[PDB]
Amino acid sequence: SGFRKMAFPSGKVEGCMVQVTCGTTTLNGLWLDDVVYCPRHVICTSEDMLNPNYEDLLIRKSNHNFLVQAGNVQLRVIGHSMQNCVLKLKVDTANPKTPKYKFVRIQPGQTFSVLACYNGSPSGVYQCAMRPNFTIKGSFLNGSCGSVGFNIDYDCVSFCYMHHMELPTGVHAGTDLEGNFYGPFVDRQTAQAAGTDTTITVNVLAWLYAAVINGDRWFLNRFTTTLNDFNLVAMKYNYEPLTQDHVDILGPLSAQTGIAVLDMCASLKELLQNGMNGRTILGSALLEDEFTPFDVVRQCSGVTFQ
């Protein structure tokens, strides 16, 4: 028992982290096979970042201007190209530690682990979600760009995020490993503001199932609701609309606990309307929304990875 915000084991990704320097800018790269992936803004100065013309800036760069170091050992760059907002640096040596992997573009509401790095070196690991406004709420300092987000299925690392930008409000924006930003964000230092940070309703319900499984049950009540009634309340509290697809995804947790999904929605409705009254659920005083239903099942059944 117990239920904790848990990241994937980071070792397979640690093995892929390198340092990339272009001019006076150093950040991180991801070394898979004979390709190192990194944010294209490695080519920019700070001045450049207000209005960068990436194609033009790249003309002045040759393979030997990209300094790629794996631990203490330099890699030889034999080619480079820009794909969307990432650079792909071809190197002459395949990473011997390349795991099985995929590139995935995740949907808002999905969770993933981030291996925060500086100068190619791992600092720590934590769990994140892709917010409904396509930001993430991370922990990133200058030099952390190129840190990546990932999920693991047994032995296969699915990379889904690469860190590029901090907005003025202190939330974070980045790309998938094809170099496409999540949401409307761009790699320029400009006025771009995040929209409404809505709560991931299906994730809160999953976490309330997690609480029940772990003995925290004070919030179960005598009521039920419907999708349409519940969603009048979700709207008022900036919660995502609950859909029948969400209901179906919560089926296994419903079966395990014997609590109908709509009954748990009625618990959630009362918690939204009444507050926690100074009580806690799984050691939180607010409703946690960065556990997916798959996360809950995984943690509550003990799934492992090679």
Add this chain to the structure above:
Amino acid sequence: SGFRKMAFPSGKVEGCMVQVTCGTTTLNGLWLDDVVYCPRHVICTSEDMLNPNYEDLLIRKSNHNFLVQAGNVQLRVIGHSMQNCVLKLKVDTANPKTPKYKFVRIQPGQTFSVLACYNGSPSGVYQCAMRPNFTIKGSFLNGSCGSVGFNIDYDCVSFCYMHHMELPTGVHAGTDLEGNFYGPFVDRQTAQAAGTDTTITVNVLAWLYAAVINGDRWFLNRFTTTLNDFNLVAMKYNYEPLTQDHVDILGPLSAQTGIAVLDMCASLKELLQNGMNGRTILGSALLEDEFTPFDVVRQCSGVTFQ
């Protein structure tokens, strides 16, 4: 910016995890050099656990009864001995992935990372603290025993915890790597209950410094206090007494922010007396106590590890 509950990169420890089976019991072991460390209750049946005589139970075990598997490959056990509440299984092959390491016995209030494992395989990683009642609040299911807790300093893993027991209240008890339990707990299935879970006051203050550094500042007020006055309030709220040693440890965060430690105590005092009034700090609705002052500095300055 941003501030997250962050674990150490788990790779160096992943490399040390093995599976240990004795009879019909399987749990995890830690393979360092030519020794595999595991909870001595691997020798017990469930029946045994109400009143085990470990010395007597061990007489019936030989080296070949301890099945140790590292991934897909079996290790040969050439000796075994009991030290306190752990077994040390000597194997014929030094772990080729042994990191630089130490065994440390931590003090209450110190934090560490746990690599949760089942059948020798990593499941996930999360951050914990040694509570003032010598429990930890973990995420552990049947089969997770032998999972370990650790800190990393550059390239050296300091192992501090090995998981042994769940209490009936759903909190967790374990040993250092010399096999001595933290607190009063024993490896028997009995009536043993945790004491008061007091809040780690120095850690809350560190986290309030973290909040300020990250722009969350609504709780700074016009007041100050003294240690003795503050501690009348800590006592009322089951907070650890603040000491001059605690004040000294918070010195660097005080210097960085320009907020005197006692002024921040006066902020904390008002938060304890008044509540959060429905507000949040670093995305929490309660006062977080599982970040040390060293953790805050580390995360706020971007320290890394080889």
